[PDB]
Amino acid sequence: SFIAIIPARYASTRLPGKPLADIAGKPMVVHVMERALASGADRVIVATDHPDVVKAVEAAGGEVCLTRADHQSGTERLAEVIEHYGFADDDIIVNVQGDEPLVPPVIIRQVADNLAACSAGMATLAVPIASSEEAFNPNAVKVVMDAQGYALYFSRATIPWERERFAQSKETIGDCFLRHIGIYAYRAGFIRRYVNWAPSQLEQIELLEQLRVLWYGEKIHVAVAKAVPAVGVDTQSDLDRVRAIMLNQ
Amino acid sequence: SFIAIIPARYASTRLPGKPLADIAGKPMVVHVMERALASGADRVIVATDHPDVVKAVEAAGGEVCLTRADHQSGTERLAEVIEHYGFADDDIIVNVQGDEPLVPPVIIRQVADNLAACSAGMATLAVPIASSEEAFNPNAVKVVMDAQGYALYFSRATIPWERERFAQSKETIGDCFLRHIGIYAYRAGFIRRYVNWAPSQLEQIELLEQLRVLWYGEKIHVAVAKAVPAVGVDTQSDLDRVRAIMLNQ
Missing domain, CATH: 3.90.550.10 (Spore Coat Polysaccharide Biosynthesis Protein SpsA; Chain A)
Structure with a gap:
């Protein structure tokens, strides 16, 4: 059993409202969410700093956490989500980047399983x-x-x-x-101690x-x-590349 | 408590009979031996492949082991010495190179003490x-x-x-x-397992x-x-440098 947490930061100078950028009819963050789900995660939670992302994920039927601090770091953002949901130390959390809409489900699962075995x-x-x-x-x-x-x-x-x-x-x-x-699995207890x-x-x-x-x-x-x-999405060019893969172009 | 083992290989293309090269009235290997002793070692043993080195160390009042194999490696040579003397697994052995006649005693002791504490x-x-x-x-x-x-x-x-x-x-x-x-301390038991x-x-x-x-x-x-x-001794130039330090030149 494991949990997928997807950080979805709204602000980007090259791709404003990045998480909600449409890729073949769905916002980018919703693609990562479907892949986290297909990996076998027991829960999939988007962590975002913006109310429009909250709305988009809830409308796709997803769990979403509005984070309240301008987090100095990704591990600290994860710590906030873990305390918000009250996960146990032994829960395995996989950090799946919200700007990687072609993330292969197999690797999300791989890193969780490897964590559990090691x-x-x-x-x-x-x-x-x-x-x-x-x-x-x-x-x-x-x-x-x-x-x-x-x-x-x-x-x-x-x-x-x-x-x-x-x-x-x-x-x-x-x-x-x-x-x-940069995909990581952690025990929630490791995160509590690490911060x-x-x-x-x-x-x-x-x-x-x-x-x-x-x-x-x-x-x-x-x-x-x-x-x-596949490489994630920072530029409009990256976005077009992903859209092309999605439309078999 | 710790033991110093000094490998003294006779053969060298640039410095034949290297261990017995005279430096200010003593063979090079005997200088390393005095420094191993000054470090506080409980025993100091030269491991050499040549009967003339045996003679030179015994005449300086030292322990010396004639090794019998053309050892593929320095750790394997150490394993032979350890089995020859029958050291216990918990004995600490410091490998002090026979071609470093200016080795500072403080570091021989340092590496042994660090091994014991860690x-x-x-x-x-x-x-x-x-x-x-x-x-x-x-x-x-x-x-x-x-x-x-x-x-x-x-x-x-x-x-x-x-x-x-x-x-x-x-x-x-x-x-x-x-x-x-390249100065090392080992538990004799680590060496037995490592080989x-x-x-x-x-x-x-x-x-x-x-x-x-x-x-x-x-x-x-x-x-x-x-x-x-100080750098050890591979060339005639290195040998002169060491001799100079010894004669305050």
Whole structure:
């Protein structure tokens, strides 16, 4: 059993009222909601900062939480939702981004199941990196895992460093690189404990909040995604791409 | 209480009979031996593959073990010494390289004490990296630690990646980089268990055997060295540098 929480922030400079942008007859947030439901979530709750999103989700028959603070962080927004609904520490919560209307249901379920099976309080996913341009791009977050799937480290550096190979040429890469994708499952109790922790220096160097968890000695389980998720929606161009997939164009 | 083991390999293409190279009236290996003793080690044992080294250490009044295999690895050589002397699982063994005649006693002791205080089966040390040339040099092994000092990861990549800073310029670095130095303390029981483990793919990418430990889910405690150890001795030039320090030149 698990719960899907979908953050749906209304404000965007390039896509105003982003969550309610029509994609093939439904607002973008409602697509993510149908996919969270298709994943087998016991509950699916949209967390939004805007009354029009509330109206749209309720009309599609969904649960929705109007958040009351301009939340400094996504984990803090999740903490508010968890306290609002009064979830137990042992409930598993999957954070499914409201701007990923083509999220594959299989991965929402995967990260929840992985969380339940593992010893960590948090789980996430990664996908293969095929090009050296991405491997060497610091915008792409690389991750390295141990044998049980727990993260050793996340970095904007090119890890794991292919020593022999990169001594000759950095134009090609082997099959060892993983890009972290930002879907997460947490125990509600992990979230309650996490929000008290002070920000770390490490995380401010890399600009990767995930490192806060590792700094404080906790684990993050990572697995290769069972479906490579389509890129989400920041630009009008992204929106058209998604609409095209939806209309088999 | 702890034991210092000093590997003293005789064969070198640039410095034949390296361990017995005279430095200010004593063979190089005997200097490392005096420093291991000054660190407070309960026993100091040289492990060598050559009968002349045996003779030299015994004449300086030291314990010495003639190893019988052309050991594929330093941890395997240590395993032989441990079984030869029959150390208990709980004994702490510090591996002090026989070609570091200026090793500071304080660090030999530091790594042993850190091992005893920590929850890991293995401990090591690191020192600050001051120059971007080293930070970006893949011959320099970088390490990142968590709040309790346990290693998250060792890499030849430049970690932790200074995201904002390196987006403008990679000519300068902040104060966050640590170079791993190759002095190690182990529980004898950790060594017995470690030698059965198959080599990992991860370690072969980075060419860093330390990653084998992290891959298999074990910890390595790391601390900033209490004295920055002088570079060891591979070349005649290195040998002259050490001799000069010894003669206050």
